[PDB]
Design a protein around this ligand. Structure first.
Ligand code: F6C
Ligand code: CLA
Ligand code: CLA
Ligand code: CLA
Ligand code: CLA
Ligand code: CLA
Ligand code: CLA
Ligand code: CLA
Ligand code: CLA
Ligand SMILES: CC1=C(C/C=C(\C)CCC[C@H](C)CCC[C@H](C)CCCC(C)C)C(=O)c2ccccc2C1=O
Ligand code: SF4
Ligand code: SF4
Ligand SMILES: [Ca+2]
Lengths: 74, 62, 751, 139, 80, 135, 74, 73
């Protein structure tokens, strides 16, 4: 029971990394601004720094107050 | 776009895209394809604050 | 002709340049365009060779900066004696130095940290220090806390002299270059006036303060009947019941020295050579004789070189005469030029001197560590097991950092001060001219030892797992005996030629067991197969550290990749992704990698020490004579598989730092986790590169541009070299704090 | 062809290997007015002669590393040759007899794109085509 | 066999040619500059790939790109 | 949640009181933990019930968010205070402490300052004011 | 219980950083101000030399590489 | 950590030295068909990521199996 959980979570972690790997290949090779002019995919690139800055905030928020709450308890 | 005017960059490849810079000098030969020398208050990446631009990817702000 | 020549008020004294930091570099002293300027201001603050160009002005900065450094050490020395004066149980520990634990540095009652003030015996609550200060003040003759306090005062006023002497020698009377370049006169005064007179001064203290005080403290007079050290000289009759074979008067007691009737001194300048069995330390009478022998032999050494009275040696053409019309035939291969042009290397460049002086101060510090466990010089040192480990471990680490720094400046010398014309065909040039045969054979011996030390641990790890303990490299399987080291252990104990030394020096070598407070001060340390294998781990890790560091020195100038590596500097990240990639080709990047190998090597040395004492030396003696060691012979059988290191040394002996919460050892539990955090935190900087991080700042600068809160000091990710320096500074910090916490929690939980 | 007296050099370990006489080899040829000492690009130091100097180097980077050192002795008359194993000797530096920092006539704009680097085409445009995005005959 | 392409944003500052350790770049006459020069790369099989030319180019988002391609025996700098 | 009970009525927590030294730390604070929602292990806890703790899950949050914005506002308003002075390059490395203090007293009443930053359309820079990348 | 609370924020912190690394690597695969031409260089390239401060691990591939560490950690 | 901490150009200067040693030594009759180079930048990041992953999975796989199948059946 323990090995089966750890197996499929580690398998799922790799599949999540590869889902976002091929997102990066997709942007580089087989994406063009001409066909996707003005669509939902091109609107993401318009604010790609708003998305990244906010994953940066949540990551910073969750690590200050989880490590800080653990090492206070320590 | 004459000398001394604060101007904005419309060059997407440039570090200073959509940032303002003061024009340092204009080239009067008319055959240099990037006559404007505009000077910036922020260095780009380990280096310069000056870059040459054409007439058409600049818009003045004042 | 040796002369004192100085300038007069060369540099004004004003705060003009305090308000404009980075003034020393013209690139730094033009504005803080980015945050990279902040880090460059600290990475360049002491590289005086890039502030100016002339060796006269550089050397004045070196000499004045040493004074401000000596001031810092005197502040720190004052802090040790001041804490020993009014924040310690030193008075209690002088009375009973067995059951009382040494402790200075008590802890303020705030934040619940008063729990760190553990019980020390005698009702004193504090932190058990392991620096051995108490064992050293007893050997110095200190008895009360007033003498400690006035020495702390005597160090603060001594630090003030160092600060004044540094300002005076940079801003009032700075010496010229001719005063610096007579190294031949500096050797005379450092050999005779500093090391000779210093150990002559100390043997004066030993005979008149330490020898009488430790004579009476061994008879149990309990700090009442101890006379103050001056009362031994004001009352010369007081030292005739002790050492009666001398005379002890102002003039009447000193003339046996001049009339060469030195037999009257045999009672306080002995040559016993063993451990004083009541304290476990060396005989102070035997120590006092040592410093007198050292003093005489260093004052003599200081007359070797020729200053302005004609007589003496000249280093300049002692070097220049090591050519090859005149060498032994088997080592006549070093050039017709030989050593010419090498006295100008060690005189016109400070990095050449710093490289040698660090590699020998580093090697000295490791030699000192090996000698202060095998023959403890201080009373009640060997029985304080937490101090023996923490003194050996401190000086091995200090000695290993210094060695890496000697290889750093051996490489900064190459790409900054190496001069081809003065070094043509000489002994230095002939090394660079065959530096592929040096590294090929170093890279082979590094690899021969790698298989024949570590991979034999993986042989043992596999036979013991298969259940074939008779075909593993054990004392019971395939024995690998240290034949040439067990031979020396036999030589060093049958020579007690050297006949006068009737007591065997270093009970480690063999013969006898010293138990002082029931605890074993020192035992023979026998060598078996486990000691063959661990000594070749040491040989292997030292060699690869040499391979990393020597490669950075020889290939600092150039390589087959980058023939102009000297123009790129000492500290450059790379030369682009061409040639397949030239990441970390600088000489700095071999210091950065040699720091890891120093960490690997020395952390294996201190682990070899820590386990071999707990299993073979330390322990307690009962009422029959048998010794029950701390782990009980564990090293011989289980240190030969590196699964045994992980369970019988790392898992087993970390019980004291793991179960340390809610006790007085609680802070070692936090440091042990703290070191683990910093090590894992270091790998962010080591495994990643600054292209990812710079591109992450851009997305974060945007979030500040949006809210109009951007800074004008533009945030730049750390340099490539900076990010590698941060990674190694944290890996070594974290990986040492975890070892420091593990050693001291284990040994302050025992004694 | 090439000729000159070799500098006073005790021989190194960083010099020519089996690639020298099998694939090809380089020779830098310079004239010095003085008998001084220069740093070897293959480690060490050698004394350059009084007349025509000839030195054999394994790769072109060493020759121009040494050539950049000769300009610090005020020597700018060096020539770099490329010796194929069959034996013929090509002149490769300076290719036109004048140094590449100088501008001649008759040299051609080679691998020049008549566009800003910013408007190189996307990789999807050249998808399943021989060319890359940076040759890209548009603009 | 790398690919050192030069773009029209050069100013003829000549700095890219000096930094090249293998003499791949050289100046040709031009008219799109006050300097009347532009970099060219006639010897790119000799390009080692060090990108030292790109560090010297002062035009913002620089005019000279090394495009690391098929790496051969002289574009990897092997003396053996 | 109803598993949590006050440390008044908690057998595992009176035991904490029994074997407690004092020294400064386990009497004066530990009496004040008697008013907290206390688990089945004698450990004070932070639960989110209803109005019972609606003021106590607002005292830390109001005190922090005010003084976090206070640091943020004074730090922000000091930055624009020196961008307009055209000296912000060295005004940052050498803190102008009379200006910085005067920017702190503006940040005492920062919650009402941010509203009139927002209502004036002046807090947030417009999108084509901001240096970005190719996208 | 309370111990379960803290790990779910370690897990949340884990899933956010490894999303941040991957999203940053996908959205900056087209390029950012440090090298605006990443699409020409492909997916897996080392760097763009030591110029402009140094561009180690700049490719979109190096964000997939950097996020395997965070995936394994999480 | 070897493939992740120490980077390529260190190993090329060391392989360049071993290539010198092999050419200059007697009785070593083998010779590389293809020149030995230190493996590339993006490859070491992948070779070091494979070891980190295999060491992350073998260590925890062995822990999880042995710490559960030893207390119990
Ligand atoms: C043939 C081929 C060849 C030859 C011959 O011919 C050789 C040789 C040499 C000599 C001379 C020397 C010495 C030796 C000894 O001591 O030790 C051993 C080792 C070995 C390896 C040994 C080996 C030998 C042979 C190979 C044997 C054979 C085997 C079999 C045949 C296999 C089987 C087959 C099947 C199919 C599988 C060496 C060396 C070195 N290497 Mg070296 N090799 C080679 C190969 C190779 C490869 C692939 C690689 C990769 C892995 C390398 C690597 C290396 C390194 C790191 C080093 C070092 O360190 C060293 C040196 O530097 O010095 C100084 N290297 N090397
Ligand atoms: C630590 C996380 C973890 C854990 C607990 C497991 C647990 C398990 N895995 Mg595994 N696995 C993991 C991560 C994990 N996996 C990841 C990240 C991968 C992707 C590479 C795999 C891919 C994988 C495969 C292909 C298989 C399993 C299988 C199994 C099951 C039987 C092996 C065993 O007894 O346990 C031992 C504990 C281990 C850590 C060993 C796991 C097996 C390794 C990972 C296989 C590695 C594949 C490798 C690339 C191929 C070998 C090369 C070959 C040419 C020799 C078991 C429940 C087997 C199965 O499906 O059951 C019938 C099986 O066929 N897994
Ligand atoms: C109040 C007395 C005084 C004054 C006004 C000056 C003034 C000056 N000194 Mg001087 N100096 C002094 C005392 C003084 N010094 C003393 C006592 C020494 C002996 C150490 C020196 C040795 C010295 C040298 C070698 C040099 C100067 C230089 C200078 C000039 C440059 C200013 C500067 O260094 O920027 C920096 C401003 C600072 C405040 C630096 C202080 C940093 C201190 C020393 C750190 C050390 C302690 C540190 C906290 C250690 C603890 C670390 C711990 C936290 C881990 C400047 C005019 C330099 C020069 O001539 O310019 C060309 C030069 O190179 N001084
Ligand atoms: C259905 C799933 C799937 C498929 C079809 C692909 C397909 C592809 N991927 Mg991929 N990817 C996936 C899932 C997938 N991926 C996942 C889950 C991840 C996260 C790890 C990735 C992350 C990823 C990256 C970063 C890249 C690709 C790339 C590619 C392309 C080239 C394949 C290649 O490199 O050659 C063959 C690959 C190999 C032969 C692998 C080499 C050896 C690996 C590391 C296994 C080693 C295991 C080891 C031996 C086990 C130890 C044994 C024992 C000791 C325990 C290809 C189209 C490349 C690309 O996009 O091209 C531009 C690229 O750089 N992928
Ligand atoms: C112990 C190891 C360790 C630690 C603490 C971190 C911590 C962090 N990583 Mg990192 N990482 C690591 C190992 C580690 N990493 C390794 C081995 C890799 C592979 C190279 C990575 C690769 C990586 C990437 C690619 C990224 C991070 C990011 C982050 C930051 C986001 C999480 C956060 O903000 O929480 C809060 C902060 C902390 C928990 C740090 C502790 C706070 C200190 C102690 C303050 C006190 C200082 C004072 C002197 C005492 C954070 C500082 C991401 C980031 O930067 O987010 C924007 C980012 O993109 N990491
Ligand atoms: C007998 C004369 C004598 C003595 C005792 C010293 C002592 C010292 N010298 Mg000096 N030196 C001398 C002559 C002497 N020198 C001569 C003639 C020259 C010209 C060639 C030099 C040139 C010189 C340079 C360039 C430097 C020294 C340095 C030092 C210090 C080394 C720090 C150390 O190792 O441990 C420290 C030991 C301390 C013992 C106690 C300090 C007490 C004072 C300073 C000396 C003792 C006073 C004594 C009672 C009289 C040390 C205090 C280095 C230094 O630190 O610069 C300040 C250094 O940079 N010396
Ligand atoms: C080098 C430092 C040093 C200093 C400052 C002194 C100082 C002193 N010694 Mg002394 N001594 C020393 C080293 C030193 N000693 C060494 C190395 C030996 C062994 C050879 C001796 C053996 C010795 C004896 C036997 C006596 C002294 C005595 C004395 C005191 C008076 C003699 C005198 O004026 O001269 C005097 C305070 C005399 C004294 O007053 O006894 C307390 C006394 O008789 N010393
Ligand atoms: C007598 C001892 C000594 C002296 C005088 C120097 C002096 C110098 N070293 Mg140095 N070095 C030493 C020992 C010494 N080193 C040792 C033991 C090592 C091995 C770690 C090194 C390795 C080393 C490297 C790799 C470099 C130097 C450099 C330098 C030069 C500039 C220092 C600097 O940047 O400002 C001061 C910098 C700091 C104060 C940074 C402090 C941050 C540390 C790492 C944190 C300490 C952790 C803390 C204890 C917890 C300077 C001439 C640099 C140089 O460029 O030479 C020209 C350089 O690249 N050294
Ligand atoms: C007064 C200055 C100031 C202000 C108003 C901000 C404001 C902000 N920062 Mg920022 N930051 C600052 C300084 C500042 N920062 C400094 C000096 C650093 C280097 C340590 C950072 C590094 C940083 C990162 C990595 C991130 C932010 C982010 C943010 C945004 C939301 C998260 C947050 O509350 O702050 C976060 C605060 C920190 C990470 C620590 C800095 C706080 C200290 C105490 C600054 C005080 C300086 C003093 C007043 C002078 C927010 C607009 C996040 C974002 O991108 O927005 C969504 C984000 O990811 N900051
Ligand atoms: C995290 C990381 C960074 C980013 C590192 C940074 C940004 C350093 C962070 C230090 C912070 C910014 C300290 C700043 C302190 C401020 C001045 C705040 C102080 C204000 C109070 C005192 C009032 C790199 O640049 C890098 C480069 C190369 C390899 C790996 C890495 C890497 O791992
Ligand atoms: S490519 Fe760059 S360095 Fe060369 S001429 Fe053009 S702008 Fe100058
Ligand atoms: S920039 Fe970084 S990855 Fe590129 S060659 Fe230099 S060190 Fe290597
Ligand atoms: Ca057998």
């Amino acid at each position: 029971m323990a090995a089966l959980y750890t197996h499929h979570q580690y398998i799922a972690g790799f599949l999540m990394v590869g889902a976002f790997s091929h997102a990066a290949i997709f942007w580089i090779k087989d994406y063009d601004p001409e066909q996707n002019k003005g669509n939902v995919l091109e609107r993401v690139l318009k604010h790609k720094e708003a998305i990244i800055a906010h994953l940066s905030w949540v990551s910073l928020f969750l690590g200050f107050h989880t490590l800080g709450l653990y090492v206070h308890n320590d | 776009v004459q000398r001394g005017s604060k101007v904005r960059i419309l060059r997407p490849e440039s570090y200073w895209f959509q940032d303002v810079g003061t024009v340092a000098s204009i080239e009067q030969g008319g055959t240099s394809r990037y006559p404007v020398i505009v000077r910036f208050d922020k260095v780009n990446y380990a280096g310069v604050n000056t870059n040459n631009f054409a007439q058409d990817e600049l818009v003045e702000v004042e | 002709e040796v002369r004192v020549v100085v300038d007069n008020d060369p540099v004004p004294t004003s705060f003009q340049k305090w308000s404009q930091p980075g003034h020393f570099d013209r690139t730094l002293a033009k504005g803080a365009k980015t945050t990279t300027w902040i880090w460059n201001l600290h990475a360049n603050a002491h590289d005086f060779d890039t502030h100016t160009s002339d060796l006269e002005d550089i050397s004045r900065k070196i000499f004045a900066a040493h004074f401000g450094h000596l001031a810092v050490v005197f502040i720190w020395l004052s802090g040790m004696y001041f804490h020993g004066a009014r924040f310690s149980n030193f008075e209690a520990w002088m009375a009973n130095p067995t059951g009382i634990k040494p402790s200075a540095q008590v802890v303020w009652p705030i934040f619940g940290q008063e729990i760190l003030n553990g019980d020390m015996g005698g009702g004193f609550h504090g932190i058990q220090i392991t620096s051995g200060l108490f064992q050293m003040w007893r050997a110095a003759g200190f008895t009360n806390t007033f003498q400690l306090y006035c020495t702390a005062i005597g160090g603060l006023v001594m630090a003030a002299l160092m600060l004044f002497a540094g300002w005076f020698h940079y801003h009032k009377r700075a010496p010229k270059l001719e005063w610096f370049q007579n190294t031949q006169s500096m050797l005379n005064h450092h050999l005779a006036g500093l090391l000779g007179l210093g150990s002559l001064g100390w043997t004066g203290h030993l005979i008149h303060v330490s020898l009488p005080t430790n004579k009476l403290l061994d008879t149990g007079v309990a700090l009442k009947d101890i006379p103050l050290p001056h009362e031994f000289i004001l009352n010369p009759s007081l030292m005739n019941k002790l050492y009666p074979h001398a005379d002890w008067g102002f003039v009447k007691g000193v003339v046996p020295f001049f009339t060469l009737q030195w037999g009257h001194f045999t009672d306080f300048l002995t040559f016993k050579g063993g451990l004083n069995p009541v304290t476990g330390g060396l005989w102070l009478t035997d120590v006092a004789h040592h410093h007198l022998a050292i003093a005489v032999m260093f004052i003599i050494a200081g007359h070797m070189y020729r200053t302005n009275w004609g007589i003496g040696h000249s280093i300049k053409e002692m070097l220049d005469d090591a050519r090859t019309p005149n060498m032994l035939p088997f080592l006549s291969f070093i050039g017709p030029v030989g050593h010419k042009g090498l006295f100008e290397v060690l005189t016109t460049s400070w990095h050449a001197q710093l490289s040698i002086n660090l590699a020998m101060l580093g090697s000295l510090s490791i030699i000192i560590a090996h000698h202060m466990y095998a023959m403890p010089p201080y009373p009640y040192l060997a029985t304080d097991y937490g101090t023996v480990v923490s003194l050996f471990t401190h000086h091995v680490w200090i000695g290993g950092f210094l060695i890496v720094g000697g290889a750093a400046h051996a490489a900064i010398y190459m790409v900054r001060d190496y001069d081809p014309e003065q070094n043509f065909n000489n002994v230095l040039d002939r090394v660079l001219r065959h530096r592929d045969a040096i590294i090929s054979h170093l890279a082979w011996v590094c690899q021969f030892l790698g298989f024949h030390s570590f991979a034999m641990y993986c042989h043992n790890d596999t036979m013991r797992a298969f259940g074939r303990p008779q075909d593993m490299f054990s004392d019971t399987g395939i024995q690998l005996q240290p034949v040439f080291a067990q031979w020396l252990q036999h030589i060093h104990t049958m020579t007690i030629a050297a006949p006068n030394l009737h007591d065997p020096v270093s009970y480690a070598f063999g013969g006898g067991v010293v138990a002082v407070g029931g605890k074993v001060a020192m035992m023979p340390i026998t060598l078996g197969t486990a000691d063959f294998l661990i000594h070749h781990i040491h040989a292997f890790t030292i060699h690869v550290t040499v391979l990393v560091l020597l490669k950075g020195v020889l290939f600092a100038r150039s390589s087959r990749l980058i023939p102009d590596k000297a123009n790129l500097g000492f500290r450059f990240p790379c030369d682009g992704p061409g040639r397949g990639g030239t990441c970390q080709v600088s000489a700095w990047d071999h210091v950065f990698l040699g720091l890891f190998w120093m960490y690997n090597s020395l952390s294996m040395v201190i682990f070899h020490f820590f386990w071999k004492m707990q299993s073979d030396v330390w322990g307690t003696v009962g009422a029959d004579g048998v010794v029950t060691h701390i782990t009980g012979g564990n090293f011989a059988t289980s240190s030969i598989t590196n699964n045994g290191w992980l369970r019988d040394f790392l898992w087993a002996q970390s019980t004291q730092v793991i179960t340390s919460y809610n006790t007085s050892l609680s802070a070692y539990g936090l440091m042990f986790l703290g070191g683990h955090f910093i090590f894992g935190f270091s790998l962010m900087f080591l495994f990643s590169g600054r292209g990812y991080w710079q591109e992450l700042i851009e997305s974060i600068v945007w979030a500040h541009n949006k809210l109009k809160v951007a800074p004008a000091i533009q945030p730049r990710a750390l340099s490539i070299i900076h990010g590698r320096a941060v990674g190694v500074a944290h890996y070594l910090l974290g990986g040492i704090v975890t070892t420091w916490a593990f050693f001291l929690a284990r040994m302050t939980a025992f004694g | 062809t090439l000729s000159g007296q070799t500098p006073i050099f005790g021989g190194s370990t960083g010099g020519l290997l089996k690639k020298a006489e099998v694939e090809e080899k380089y020779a830098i040829t310079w004239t010095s007015p003085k008998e001084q000492v220069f740093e070897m690009p293959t480690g060490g130091a050698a004394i350059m002669r009084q007349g025509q100097n000839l030195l054999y180097l394994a790769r072109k980077e060493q020759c121009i590393a040494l050539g950049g050192q000769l300009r610090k002795f005020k020597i700018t008359d060096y020539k770099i040759y490329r010796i194929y194993p069959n034996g013929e000797t090509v002149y490769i530096h300076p290719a036109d007899g004048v140094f590449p920092e100088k501008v001649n006539q008759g040299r051609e704009k080679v691998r020049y794109n008549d566009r800003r680097i910013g408007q190189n085409p996307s990789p999807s445009k050249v998808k399943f085509s021989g060319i890359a995005t940076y040759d890209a005959p548009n603009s | 066999s790398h690919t050192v392409k030069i773009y029209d944003t050069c100013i003829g500052c000549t700095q890219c040619v000096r930094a090249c350790p293998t003499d791949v770049l050289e100046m040709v006459p031009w008219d799109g500059c006050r300097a009347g020069q532009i970099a060219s790369s006639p010897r790119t099989e000799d390009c080692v790939g060090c990108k030292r030319c790109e560090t010297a180019c002062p035009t913002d988002f620089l005019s000279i790109r090394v495009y690391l391609g098929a790496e051969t025996t002289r574009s990897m700098g092997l003396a053996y | 949640n109803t598993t949590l009970v006050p440390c008044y009525k908690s057998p595992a927590f009176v035991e904490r009181m029994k074997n407690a030294p004092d020294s400064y730390y386990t009497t004066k604070p530990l009496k004040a933990y008697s008013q907290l929602l206390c688990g089945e292990d004698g450990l004070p806890r932070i639960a989110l019930d209803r109005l019972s703790l609606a003021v106590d899950v607002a005292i830390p949050i109001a005190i922090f968010l005010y003084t976090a914005g206070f640091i943020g506002w004074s730090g922000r308003s000091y930055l624009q205070a020196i961008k307009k002075q055209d000296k912000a390059e060295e005004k940052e490395v050498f803190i102008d402490v009379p200006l910085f203090i005067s920017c702190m007293v503006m940040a005492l009443f920062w919650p009402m300052a941010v509203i009139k930053e927002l209502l004036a359309g002046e807090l947030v820079a417009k999108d084509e004011e901001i240096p970005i990348s190719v996208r | 219980g309370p111990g379960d609370f803290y790990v779910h924020h370690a897990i949340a912190l884990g899933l956010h950083v490894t999303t941040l690394i991957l999203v940053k690597g996908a959205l900056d695969a087209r390029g950012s101000k440090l090298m605006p031409d990443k699409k020409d260089f492909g997916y897996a390239f080392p760097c763009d030399g030591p110029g402009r401060g140094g561009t180690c691990d700049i490719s979109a591939w190096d964000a997939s590489y950097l996020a395997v560490f965070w995936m394994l950690n999480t | 950590f070897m493939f992740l901490i120490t980077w390529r150009g260190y190993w090329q200067e060391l392989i360049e030295t071993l290539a010198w040693a092999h050419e200059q030594t007697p009785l070593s009759f083998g010779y590389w068909r293809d020149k030995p180079v230190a493996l590339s930048i993006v490859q070491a990041r992948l070779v070091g990521l494979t070891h980190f992953t295999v060491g992350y999975i073998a260590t925890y796989g062995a822990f999880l199996i042995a710490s559960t199948a030893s207390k119990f059946g």
